[PDB]
Design a protein around this ligand. Structure first.
Ligand SMILES: Nc1ncnc2c1ncn2[C@@H]1O[C@H](COP(=O)(O)OP(=O)(O)O)[C@@H](O)[C@H]1O
Ligand SMILES: Nc1ncnc2c1ncn2[C@@H]1O[C@H](COP(=O)(O)OP(=O)(O)O)[C@@H](O)[C@H]1O
Ligand code: CLF
Ligand code: SF4
Ligand SMILES: [Mg+2]
Ligand SMILES: [Mg+2]
Lengths: 520, 456, 111, 272, 272
């Protein structure tokens, strides 16, 4: 049934944006609305279409000048807020570009300023030959023709390539407008314009991955070990030119269907490339995904070998945390796909109880996925506002919340710990090792001795003041049995602080080897 | 003075005007602003304040979409005010901050205020004290500094009301940290001077309490703002962050205004205290001589041994950056580059900048700067020992191996920098010792005469 | 009834192939994957005439493995009742994902 | 000072009527008149200055900056010492004239361009009010009265009704009122009866009827108003009467725009 | 298909001439014509649809969303199966009508509204091209030819000259060309001579002369064109000749705008 919040009675439109799973209901009984306009003044969590296009999908590309046509403020506001890394020395994190539109450019036109800014950026970074121009609110209203300027700059330089993304912040209800716009733009302008140099025997496009803390590198490692060529990645750790070659892959391996399903559906409709939805998170979802990809190419035995090896290495460590986390309650509050990527896997493989999910921008498809994969009684919210979140916490009493940084700092002031669902904490959270890293983060947040200390009132007359120390393991062992506590097979996470250094230093070795053989 | 020759931006130093108006608004008790425009315009600013403070602050949006831009979006603001007021019954001040989009299309938010006060407030919130104001912040003008300056002017102009005279002064702090306000309030309390402090941002640091939840908020009240008209005088520390409000008070209510100096370092703190002493009649007491002496003893331990002849690049909010340059010169350091990151035309007329040009010989001042100014000068051969700046220039520091002291806004890559002063004598001691310790850690990382840190 | 609820429940808790973006694509996804699963469980070798048929088959292979592992009563039934059951399963998944769906985006004509 | 904004269909004669009425006001009624042109093509002050000004508020902001705009570089003086300024703006197809008008009127208020001794301040606005920046002349602290120029052509009346719709909105925010409809004749059959019916239907009046005369074009080719060209001509007397009727106007209303089915029904008797 | 944009001074008869020529093209020459009104007041297809359309592209995005705009909800069919769409836009004094035209034309492109078997696609634009969004019809992939409607009045010629100045940019960027100047007579003394001389000084031709006739008013009051109203009237034959001249046009040039001193010297012969 549709859940109406006490804080949202005055805005009755909010009633049909929340459901509570009930026994005897299916997807055709009730379903929260989605991808609608925001109610003004609600202090919702939603962003703008420029965010969805530029900040989320565009910037991950590693060999590109990302210049926003607009004032400095849009460019500053999205700079150094994301954790998509690259093997291009993180160029996409360290350099950001604006045309710096002033009032004279608003009144008289900013196209000359855009052309001059593009030439300046190419001049300052002569090793970069690719560029994307993003519209902002300002330059989208006044009608600047960015496409004509991009054509002029390309012909004046003769060795650069420019992509145009016309996604101003107001052009849509949330980041989702940006997802759609940039997908269709890249497909229509850029796909098919470059031919691959080498095409191996099993070629995939890895679609919908943005390399948060090295998530893509983790997945590339697995594909290398199955002998699968990743032609391009959309767009984490992705290069401009490889993404122009997407029309030549045997299979589209889609991870985030909220942000990249558009290009996948259109590549399927145009070039006949099949679309295979996968999970990167969890042990069993990731194992099944690897099995499907290897099965498509007839190389199943390679996937099974990876899976057995990874299970033997990481399953004992994951089960150490799973034993200590059984029954703990969590609120799953990302923006998009991570709510249905995690809801079932976290309950099964860490023992947590998912009491609520929400999406900031997701459509009704994300909610039908999320409601399906959640248990009965879970609260599913679309376009949540701050007061609704407070009410949900007071009703559900979660032990941890997975949400954003600023929402996390809010719920901290209501007693609850948080893990960053967006940027991770000690990521990457993808892979088999990554799931163990996620479990350790959950366990550290929940069983912190500092959390119990903060709950203690020292001015209370008979206050339970103690001395010495406690550890998280002391706190968590109070919840397990003797058989679990003295198990000789379960042990804590044995991994480096930077798990990606060794993974990246392996993907690069593989690349070198493959090049050697090919060039011979 | 060098004006940046490029027209585009590579790595901006500041954000836009609406962000500054939003930051000024969160310093007022029972105030939630509505940013009129796209949702990104408010969500990113809340994230940016969160990066600096590691706290969450309530700011609302009118959520302008495509139909709002094409058809007009004043109905969005009317809906936003109603929704915000019904759902937050403790709110008394609602500033309506415009953005680039609604400044371009010409949404008449001033006229809407009149209608709201005549129709919506008396009808659906009868007897409730609600004050609405507009802050016009076109992001293609100025920067977050000018947005902050304008918002302080707008808040004062809304509320200041002539009444019985008060012995208080007005202290407009400028854009400062909670640690800075604590230091300034300590100075005033030793001098025995009551002030209307704009703004009281110590409560930005909220405690993690056992039972009673307690969120971050500002502590400047409507009564503080109302009483600004009755003060003996106004001291605005920052000429670019509060001189407009002070000029308004002088012109409208004849409240004498003293602009600056920013009390960065020993000498400028003395000048600030002398201004307070002249305004109020209160003598500088012997306790301040002692606290000043303590800061000077710390500085003497490190000054001509470690700080003399160190080459420094500085960027911050303009007033803080200029004051930091002056303090570094007093410490015998060699400031090489000063970055003033926006297009304000008052910098070249600023008496502090004219004095820097006269007597700081190897210092280059770049107005309308971005971070590519600093980085491309290092690539061309500028050698620095130290950088003073905020966190968005951290990759220059990381990649070129120049240590940086985190000052200004935002400093998100170090823990708890908002709790330490850079103003006053306490701030001078904190600043000088942090510079020394940053340099010490760098010598040890590079093994650069690191054996010398034994009998200094 | 007692045979459909475990099968439908496993699909909706574990699988992602039934949640395509548009109803006309969901119909093809449902038909291809479920028919091939019925063939696998009946001892047949499905024949592929397209790359999408092969993509249907990988989902079908994984799903049939899970059904064999978790529902032993399938390997005891004979082909007529397996066909009827998978005909019923196909109808139920179609109703849940397309016919009775409250997801109104499935009728958006563009991707 | 009576601050007035002129609206109406494009090319209906707003600029010509404003300049000619201003000349008649200055010459026949000895009034201090100011004209602020709010059209980017900056053609609202040619008949008074005897040629297009070459300094616009926006051209000056583009070259020197907003802070270096002065009430001496952009405000000019023409016939009978009528003070004129042009907002300026971009050439067609680029930028944002709406923002330019917002900024230009803001700057002229900041620099006290409108002197206390003015009897009339005319904001001459373009015909396509496409944005909120072209309604800046009817915000609080700006024009308190609006005159709409129309004619017997059904599109001109439709444009007048459309302008009244937008003017009803601001009437509930700002206290701007409609002073009447000025009819610049286009020689339409039933033009007078159509205009009388339409003004009554929306709650206003036809303040004056301005005939269609070729002497207006002749004076315009000679860079002047009819009052400057030929003070004793009949068209000059019409502008003088129109100026007199504006001076003595006291009927300022919130218009009631007609639904399109009402206007469609009204125009049936005129196509016969 | 020949994609054309119509520009000119405000209220000079862009919409009337566009609709009447479209009706003549469809009726006398059996042509497939499409009209895209690029004016927020949405009056560019009333004569073809026989009444103001009640679904613009912008009204449909506001009600349904961008993703639900369909080439069946917003495209209507009128006289001689002429297909008509209106961009729509805000009421006067609010919003951005330039952005609405950008979005409306974008949406008609994404939904492939303009068929490939069309013979003519007219973009009927407003008279105040105040921003870049009103130049959207002459971007790449849009109108390839521009006809400016003018008249012998000096402000119409000045407006036509201004449009030529702004049109230089799009002639360079998208290759759009000026096909000629349509002269809608305003009964100005020496009108034909002034138009010939002006069209010669900028490098183009007066493609046709449209007489000022009141049958156009009568037909407009009757919600139809002259061709629908009275096919055998003289004015209908004038639109039939203009349509034929547009069909058989091969003179497409980049106009060379006149500095205003040249235009000032030119208008002296006509102020006598
Ligand atoms: N009463 C009139 N008789 C004859 N021509 C007129 C009359 N009023 C205006 N005109 C003509 O109208 C043309 C366009 O008018 P203009 O003032 O430029 O329009 P707007 O300012 O409304 O765009 C001018 O060239 C002028 O000669
Ligand atoms: N050839 C003509 N003869 C008579 N009246 C005309 C003629 N062309 C246009 N008109 C009149 O011009 C009025 C306004 O023209 P319109 O086409 O609406 O202008 P625009 O589209 O340029 O804004 C119409 O209402 C019509 O009565
Ligand atoms: S310069 Fe500043 S932050 Fe930029 S928009 Fe303008 S006021 Fe705002 Fe806003 S919604 Fe997104 S983030 Fe921008 S494209 Fe618009
Ligand atoms: S319609 Fe008005 S606000 Fe919008 S771009 Fe054009 S001039 Fe500017
Ligand atoms: Mg005019
Ligand atoms: Mg028209």
């Amino acid at each position: 049934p549709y859940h109406e919040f006490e804080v949202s009675k005055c805005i009755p439109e909010r009633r049909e944006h929340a459901v509570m799973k009930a026994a005897g209901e299916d997807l055709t009984s009730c379903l929260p609305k989605g991808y609608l306009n925001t109610i003004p003044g609600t202090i919702s969590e939603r962003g703008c279409a420029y965010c969805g296009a530029k900040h989320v999908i565009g910037t991950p590309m590693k060999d590109v000048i990302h210049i926003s046509h607009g004032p400095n403020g849009c460019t500053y506001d999205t700079w150094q807020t994301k954790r998509y890394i690259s093997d291009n020395d993180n160029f996409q994190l360290k350099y950001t570009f604006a045309t710096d539109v002033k009032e004279k450019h608003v009144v008289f036109g900013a196209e000359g300023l855009l052309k001059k800014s593009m030439h300046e950026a190419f001049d300052a970074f002569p090793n970069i030959k690719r560029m994307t121009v993003y519209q902002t609110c300002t330059t989208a209203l006044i009608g600047d023709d960015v496409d004509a300027i991009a054509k002029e700059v390309m012909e004046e330089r003769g060795d650069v390539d420019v992509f145009v993304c016309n996604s101003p912040g107001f052009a849509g209800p949330s980041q989702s407008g940006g997802h759609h716009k940039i997908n269709i733009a890249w497909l229509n302008q850029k796909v098919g314009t470059v031919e691959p140099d080498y095409l191996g025997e099993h070629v995939i496009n890895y679609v919908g991955e943005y390399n948060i803390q090295g998530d893509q590198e983790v997945m590339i490692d697995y594909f290398n070990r199955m002998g699968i060529q990743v032609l391009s990645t959309f767009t984490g750790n992705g290069s401009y030119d490889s993404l122009r070659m997407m029309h030549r892959a045997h299979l589209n391996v889609l991870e985030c269907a909220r942000s990249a399903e558009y290009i996948c559906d259109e590549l399927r409709a145009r070039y006949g490339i099949p679309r295979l939805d996968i999970d990167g998170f969890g042990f069993e979802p990731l194992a099944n995904s690897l099995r499907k990809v290897a099965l498509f190419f007839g190389i199943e035995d390679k996937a099974e070998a990876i899976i057995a090896e990874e299970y033997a290495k990481w399953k004992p460590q994951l089960d150490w945390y799973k034993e200590r986390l059984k029954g703990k309650k969590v609120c799953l509050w990302p923006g998009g796909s991570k709510l249905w990527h995690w809801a079932h896997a976290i309950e099964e493989e860490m023992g947590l109880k998912v009491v609520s999910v929400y999406t900031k921008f997701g459509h009704q498809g994300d909610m039908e996925k999320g409601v399906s994969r959640c248990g009965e009684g879970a609260l599913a919210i679309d376009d949540p506002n701050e007061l609704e979140s407070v009410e949900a916490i007071e009703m559900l009493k979660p032990d941890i919340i997975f949400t954003g940084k600023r929402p996390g700092e809010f719920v901290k002031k209501h007693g609850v710990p948080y893990l960053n669902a967006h940027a991770y904490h000690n990521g990457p959270y993808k892979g088999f090792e990554g799931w163990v890293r996620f479990a350790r983060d959950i366990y550290n947040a929940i069983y912190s001795p500092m959390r119990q200390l903060a709950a203690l009132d020292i001015s209370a007359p008979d206050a339970a003041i103690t001395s010495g120390f406690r550890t998280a393991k002391m706190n968590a062992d109070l919840t397990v049995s003797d058989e679990v506590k003295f198990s000789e097979v379960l042990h804590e996470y044995t991994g480096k602080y930077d798990s990606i250094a060794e993974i990246r230093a392996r993907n690069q070795a593989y690349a070198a080897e493959q090049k050697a053989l090919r060039d011979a | 003075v060098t004006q940046k020759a490029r027209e585009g931006t590579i790595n901006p130093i500041f954000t836009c005007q609406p962000a500054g108006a939003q930051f000024a608004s969160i310093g007022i008790k029972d105030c939630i602003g509505i940013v009129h425009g796209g949702q990104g315009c408010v969500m990113f600013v809340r994230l940016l304040i969160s990066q600096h403070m590691k706290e969450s602050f309530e700011i609302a949006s009118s959520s302008v979409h495509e139909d709002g831009a094409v058809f007009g979006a004043l109905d969005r603001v009317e809906t936003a005010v109603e929704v915000l007021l019904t759902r937050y019954p403790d709110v008394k001040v609602v500033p309506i901050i415009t953005t680039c989009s609604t400044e371009i299309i010409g949404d008449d938010v001033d006229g809407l205020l009149s209608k709201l006060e005549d129709e919506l407030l008396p009808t659906k919130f009868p007897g409730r004290e609600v004050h609405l104001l507009t802050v016009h912040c076109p992001s293609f003008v100025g920067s977050m500094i000018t947005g902050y300056d304008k918002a302080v002017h707008d808040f004062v102009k809304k509320f200041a009301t002539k009444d019985e005279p008060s012995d208080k002064i007005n202290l407009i702090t400028g854009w400062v940290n909670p640690g800075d306000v604590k230091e300034l309030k300590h100075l005033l309390e030793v001098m025995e001077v009551k002030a209307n402090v704009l703004f009281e941002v110590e409560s930005f640091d909220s405690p993690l309490m056992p039972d009673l939840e307690h969120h971050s908020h500002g502590s400047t009240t409507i009564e503080d703002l109302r009483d600004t008209a009755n003060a003996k005088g106004t001291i605005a520390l920052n000429r670019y962050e509060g001189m407009k409000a002070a000029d308004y008070l002088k012109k409208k209510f004849k409240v004498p205004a003293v602009i600056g100096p920013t009390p960065v370092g020993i000498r400028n703190t003395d000048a600030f205290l002398k201004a307070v002493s002249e305004m109020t009649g209160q003598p500088i007491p012997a306790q301040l001589v002692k606290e000043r002496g303590l800061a000077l003893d710390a500085i003497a331990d490190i000054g001509h041994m470690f700080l003399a002849d160190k080459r420094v690049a500085i960027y911050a909010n303009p007033d803080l950056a200029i004051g930091l340059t002056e303090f570094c010169l007093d410490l015998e350091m060699k400031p090489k580059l000063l970055l003033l990151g926006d297009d304000n035309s008052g910098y070249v007329k600023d008496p502090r900048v004219l004095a820097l040009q006269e007597n700081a010989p190897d210092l280059e001042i770049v107005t309308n700067a971005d971070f590519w100014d600093l980085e491309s000068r290092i690539q061309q051969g500028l050698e620095l020992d130290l950088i003073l700046g905020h966190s968005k220039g951290r990759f220059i520091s990381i990649d070129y191996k120049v240590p940086m002291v985190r000052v200004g806004f935002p400093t998100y890559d170090r823990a708890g920098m908002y709790r330490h002063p850079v103003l006053g004598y306490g701030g001078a001691m904190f600043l000088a010792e942090t510079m020394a310790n940053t340099l010490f850690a760098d010598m040890e990382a590079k093994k650069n005469k690191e054996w010398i840190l034994n009998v200094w | 009834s007692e045979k459909l609820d475990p099968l439908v429940d496993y699909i909706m808790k574990n699988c992602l192939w039934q949640f395509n973006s548009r109803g006309w694509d969901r119909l093809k996804q449902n038909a291809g994957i479920l028919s091939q699963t019925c063939e696998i469980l009946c001892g047949e070798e499905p024949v592929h005439e397209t790359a999408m048929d092969r993509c249907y088959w990988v989902d079908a292979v994984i799903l049939s493995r899970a059904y064999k592992a978790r529902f032993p009563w399938l390997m005891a039934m004979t082909k007529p009742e397996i066909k009827s059951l998978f005909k019923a399963l196909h109808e139920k998944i179609d109703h849940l994902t397309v016919h009775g769906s409250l997801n109104t985006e499935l009728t958006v004509p563009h991707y | 000072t009576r601050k007035i904004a002129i609206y109406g269909k494009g090319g209906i004669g707003k600029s010509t009527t404003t300049q000619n009425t201003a000349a008649a006001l200055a010459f026949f009624h000895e009034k201090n008149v100011f004209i602020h042109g709010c059209d980017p093509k900056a053609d609202s002050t040619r008949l008074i200055l005897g040629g297009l000004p070459q300094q616009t508020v926006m051209d000056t902001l583009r070259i020197e900056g907003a802070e270096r705009v002065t009430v001496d570089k952009v405000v000019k003086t023409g016939f009978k010492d009528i003070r004129c300024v042009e907002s300026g703006g971009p050439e067609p197809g680029v930028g944002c004239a709406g923002r330019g008008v917002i900024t230009a009127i803001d700057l002229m208020e900041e620099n006290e361009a409108y002197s206390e001794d003015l009897d009339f301040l005319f904001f001459d606005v373009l015909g396509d009010v496409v944005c909120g920046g072209f309604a800046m002349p009817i915000r609080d602290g700006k024009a308190e009265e609006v005159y709409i120029v129309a004619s017997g052509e059904m599109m001109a009346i439709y444009a007048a009704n459309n302008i009244c719709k937008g003017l009803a909105k601001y009437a509930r925010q700002s206290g701007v009122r409609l002073g009447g409809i000025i009819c610049n004749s286009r020689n339409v059959d039933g033009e007078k009866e159509f205009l009388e019916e339409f003004t009554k239907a929306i709650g206003t009046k036809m303040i004056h009827f301005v005939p269609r005369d070729n002497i207006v074009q002749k004076a315009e080719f000679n860079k002047q108003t009819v009052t400057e060209f030929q003070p004793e001509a009949n068209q000059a007397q019409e502008y003088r009467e129109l100026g007199r009727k504006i001076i003595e106007n006291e009927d300022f209303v919130i218009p009631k725009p007609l639904a399109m089915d009402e206007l469609e029904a009204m125009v049936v008797k005129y196509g016969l």
